[PDB]
Design a protein around this nucleic acid. Sequence first.
DNA 1: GGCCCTAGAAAGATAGTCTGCGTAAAATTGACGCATG
DNA 2: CATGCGTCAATTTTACGCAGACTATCTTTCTAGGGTTAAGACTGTGC
DNA 3: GCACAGTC
DNA 4: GGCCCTAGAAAGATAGTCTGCGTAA
DNA 5: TTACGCAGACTATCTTTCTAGGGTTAAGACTGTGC
DNA 6: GCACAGTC
Lengths: 478, 478
Amino acid sequence: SQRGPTRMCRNIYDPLLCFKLFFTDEIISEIVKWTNAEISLKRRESMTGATFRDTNEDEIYAFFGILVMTAVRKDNHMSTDDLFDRSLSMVYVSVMSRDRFDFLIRCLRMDDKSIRPTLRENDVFTPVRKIWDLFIHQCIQNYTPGAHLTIDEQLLGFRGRCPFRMYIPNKPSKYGIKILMMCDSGTKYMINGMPYLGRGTQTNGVPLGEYYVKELSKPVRGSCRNITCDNWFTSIPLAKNLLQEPYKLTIVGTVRSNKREIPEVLKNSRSRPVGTSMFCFDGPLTLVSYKPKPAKMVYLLSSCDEDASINESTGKPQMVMYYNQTKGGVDTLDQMCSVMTCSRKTNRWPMALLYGMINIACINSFIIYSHNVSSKGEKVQSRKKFMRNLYMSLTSSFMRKRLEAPTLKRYLRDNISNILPNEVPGTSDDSTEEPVTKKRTYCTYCPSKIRRKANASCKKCKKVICREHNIDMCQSCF
Amino acid sequence: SQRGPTRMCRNIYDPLLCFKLFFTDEIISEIVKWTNAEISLKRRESMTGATFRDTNEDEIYAFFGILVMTAVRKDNHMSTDDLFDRSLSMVYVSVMSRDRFDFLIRCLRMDDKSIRPTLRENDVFTPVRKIWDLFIHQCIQNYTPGAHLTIDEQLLGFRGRCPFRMYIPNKPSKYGIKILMMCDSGTKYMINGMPYLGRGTQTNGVPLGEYYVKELSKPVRGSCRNITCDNWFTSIPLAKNLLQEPYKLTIVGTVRSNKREIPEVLKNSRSRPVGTSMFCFDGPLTLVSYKPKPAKMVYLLSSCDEDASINESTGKPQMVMYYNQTKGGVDTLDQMCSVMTCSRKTNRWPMALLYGMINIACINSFIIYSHNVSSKGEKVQSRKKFMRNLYMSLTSSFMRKRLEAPTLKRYLRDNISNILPNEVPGTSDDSTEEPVTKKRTYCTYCPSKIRRKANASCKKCKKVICREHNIDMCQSCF
DNA sequence: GGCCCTAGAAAGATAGTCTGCGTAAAATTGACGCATG
DNA sequence: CATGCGTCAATTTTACGCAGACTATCTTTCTAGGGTTAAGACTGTGC
DNA sequence: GCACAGTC
DNA sequence: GGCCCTAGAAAGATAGTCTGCGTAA
DNA sequence: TTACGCAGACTATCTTTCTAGGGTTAAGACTGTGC
DNA sequence: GCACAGTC
Ligand SMILES: [Ca+2]
Ligand SMILES: [Ca+2]
Ligand SMILES: [Ca+2]
Ligand SMILES: [Ca+2]
Ligand SMILES: [Zn+2]
Ligand SMILES: [Zn+2]
Ligand SMILES: [Zn+2]
Ligand SMILES: [Zn+2]
C-alpha cells in the first residue's frame, strides 16, 4: 500500500502548504475567535491603543512564525524583553513589538468559556479539546504509515498547576503532561495520540497498557503492520487480542521479568552462561530471553514475527535486533523536538499543549515536504532551512500590512522593506529611485520630542538636518 | 574578618577587571603562546592567508568575548555557520569571521607538547593542569569566605574520549568530567575545587569522602566555619577529625542509613509516628533522625556544639532547617551556570575544562563586582547586563584594530564603527572666534550689483558669505 | 491544592520616544532706493 | 565695478497641537531548574 | 478479603 | 576507544565574493 | 568626469567523522555486608 | 581470611 503522504496532499512542494495541512483554517479561525473574546475582557479603559486591539488570521499566523523562528534558534527560554532587543537582531521586532507579543501570548485561547460548565465535569482537557481533536484528525488523514509502528510516551514539561500533570522520574523534565503517541518507524511521522488525563482514563476492565495500544492503533487496525512497544504496554493477552478479527496488527516488545506468564526456563539461573539465549512458545507467540550480563536477563515477546534464530554476527537473537531497530520510532521524534522546539515558560497549561502541537506539526510538515520533493526528484533541504522558509511564509503577509501605518517608525519600515520577498508581478522603478523614497521629517541631531523639521541634508553623510545645526553638511562631517 | 572581596580587589567597579582577576596575564599568555605553537602545525603551504594567522592577546580576549555573548544568548549549539549568518545578527560577525572562529577554537591549546610526554604517566590532567592551577589559585586568593561553606560535586558534560570520564546516573548529563567543589554559602562564590581524575587518585588510608573535604577546605583550615556537605562525604570520622589542632571545622549533612555509626534506636523507623524525630549525642557531636513519611527515614549529622531542638514552625528538627538553608551553595552555582553557560560540542576534553573555567570566572567576577558596587552604594545590575558589558570590554580593542584593514568589507566597517563607544571626533570644549565682527558685510562671492548681505561666516575659513553662494561651508572650504 | 531551595522570566502597568502632518507666528533674508571713488 | 545705511514682505525656521504606533523599565507573582529525605501511576505479591 | 513494596 | 539508536554539529578543505588601489579611454 | 587587473580579507557549501541527546537490557566507582 | 549487591 506504500508509505507516504496520501493523495490529497501529495503534490505540495513548499513549506507553508505543508504546515497548513496540519493546522487548517478551522483551527486558526477558532483561535482567532476565542482569543478576541478574551482580549475583549482584558481591556480596561486606559488600554486603548495599538497593542491592545484584537486579532485576525494574519496576526495569528505571524505569531506562529515567531514561534517557528524561536524553535530554529535556541532562544525559547530567553526573555521576550531580550528577543526583541534591537541591535542583537531585527528578526522578531520586524514582525511585531514585544508588547504586542506579550499581550497576545497572555490572551490566546482555544475555547469558549461560556460552555465550560457543561464540559468540564466530563472532560478535564476541555480548554484544548476541540483543537487537539482537529489536529490529530489532520495528522491521520495526511499520511499512509508503513510496515512498522512504534508506541511510546512523550512528556510535555510543565510545572504550573494542572489537574492531570504527573511526575516521571526518568525523564529530562519530570513534572509535565503525559501524551501517548504512535509514530511510524523509519520516518517518525506522528500518526496518532492522546493525553493521559490522570485518573480519569475510563477504561473498562482493560488495563492501560492494552487499552492504549488498541486505541492508538485504531487507524491502522484493519491491516497488518507491526507494533513496537515498551514493557509498559507489551503483554501476553495483548499479543493474542491483537490477532483477533477487529485487529490485524502484531506486536513486538520487551516484557517485565515479573510477569506470571514467563516460564522458569527463561529465568536467570547462575548455571546459564553469559551471552546465551533461549526460545520457547506460548502457542502462536514466541517468547525469548537472553542474558547479556552475568546478573541480567532481558525478555522479549514477539507474536507474528514468528520462528526463531540467532544472528551469528552479534550472537543476539534476531528478535532483539529487530527490536533495537524499531524501538526508537517515538523518542527520535522527541529528540528532534528538543533540538528544535518552541516551548516557553508559561503559567497556563493549555499553552503547553499548543506549543507541543506546533512542534509536532513542524515535524510532520517536514516529513511530507521531504517526501514529496525527493519523490519529484529534487534535492531536499534540511529542517533548519525548511523552518527558515516557514518563518517567511507565515510572517510575510503580516509585515506587509504592518507597513501601511504612516507612522511605523523608520527602522522597522526599512527592515521590513528589505526582508519581504518583493514578489511583485512587474514592479519597477520610474527613475532608479525606490517606490517610497521619502525623507525623514525630523532633524538627526535634535531631540525627537521637539518635532523640529529638517529641510536639508548633509552631502557628506546624507542625513537630515535643521538649520540651527547645519545646512549643507553636518558638523559630524568634515 | 567578614565576608567579601579582599584588599587587592576591593575597589573594582569595572566588570572587565573583575573578569581579569580570574585569568590574569599568566593564563592568557600561556594560552596564546601554546595556541600559536599548535597553529603552526595545522598549516599547509596552500593555507597561507589571513585566516590562518598567529594569535595575540587582543584576539584571545575577543574570542573569550564571543564565548561570553554565547552564554548570554544561549548559543551553545547553533552551528557557527549559522551564528555568523548576517541578517540574523551582527553580534558575532563584527568581531571575527566564522572561519577564523572555527580555526581558532580548533587550535586552542593550554600546554607544551614537548614536555607532556614525560609528565603524562604521573598526571593524566597535564594538558589542562597549568592553567587550572593558576585559575584556582586566583579563585582562592580573592574573596574572603563567610561562616558557611558547602561541599558537593559538579559534572562537566562530555561524551567524547577522556581517560577519567565518569558516568553518573541521576544527572542532567550522564557523562563528563567530575569536579569536586567548595562554594561559599549565601553568595555562591566558587572557592576551590579539583578534578576527580579517575580511580587512580592516590590517598593514604583515608577514604575519598573524607579526603576531599580535607583538601577542599585547606585554605580555611585554620578558621572556624561550618561546612555543609552531601552524604557522599558526611561521616563520623570526618566529623571527628576536623576538630583537632589542624582543622577546626564543623560538619553538617545527611548520612547513609547503612553506616555502623547509627545506633539501633534511630535505625528503626517502625514504631515511630510520622513527623516525629529522635536524637542522641555521641560526644562532641550529635545525630538525629526523623521520619517524614510512613516508609522513610532520614539521618543527619552535626559536629557543631549544639542542641538546637525542634523548630515549631515546621516540626522539623532545627538541624534539618539549617541544612536546608546551606546545602544549596554548590548546586545553585551549577544552576546559574546552566542558565547562562558557554559550552560547545567538542571532541577535545581539555575544552570541557576550559569552558567550565569560563563560566566560573564569569560568576565569580559577578560576585566581586556586585559586592564592590553595593558597598559603594550604587545600584547593581543583573548578570545579564553584566555579561553584555563584559562582551564589549573584551571585544572592543580587537574590533578597533580589525578596522585597520583597508579592505575590511563595508558592512563590517559600518557595524563596527557604530558599536564602538569611542568612535567620536576630538570635540573641543568651546570656540573662540567664527563670525569675527564685520569683515565684509557683503558676500565676497557676490557681485557689486547685488550687494547681498552676508548672513554667514564660513565654518572653516571665516569668510564673509551669502548662503546662496556658500550654504554654511564656503565654496573654498569643504 | 500539590518536597526543600534559588534565579530570573512572565504578569501587568506606567511613563516616555520615534515617526508623520498642518497651521500660525516668529525667524530672516533678498531686493529697494539714498550716497562715495 | 568695489563699497556703505535703514526699509519692508517675501521666504524660511521654529513651536507645538492633531495624534498613532512602538519601547524602556519597574514591581510582584511564581515556573524552570538544579538538588535529593522529599514527586505520580501502574502491576503483581505478602499479612 | 486488605495494603505492601518494585519500575516508567 | 568504553550499551542501543539517530540527527546534526564540528572537522577540514575548496571554490567564490566584496573591497580598495593603480591602470587610463 | 565611467571601466578593468591585482592582492587582501571574508563567505557559502560540501562530504566525512563522531558527540549531544533521546532511550532503557545495557554507563562508573565507592561503601558496607554476603562466602 | 576472600567475593557479592545498594546510592551519587
Ligand atoms: Ca513584558
Ligand atoms: Ca518508553
Ligand atoms: Ca565551519
Ligand atoms: Ca551532591
Ligand atoms: Zn537640529
Ligand atoms: Zn554629515
Ligand atoms: Zn553671495
Ligand atoms: Zn571658507
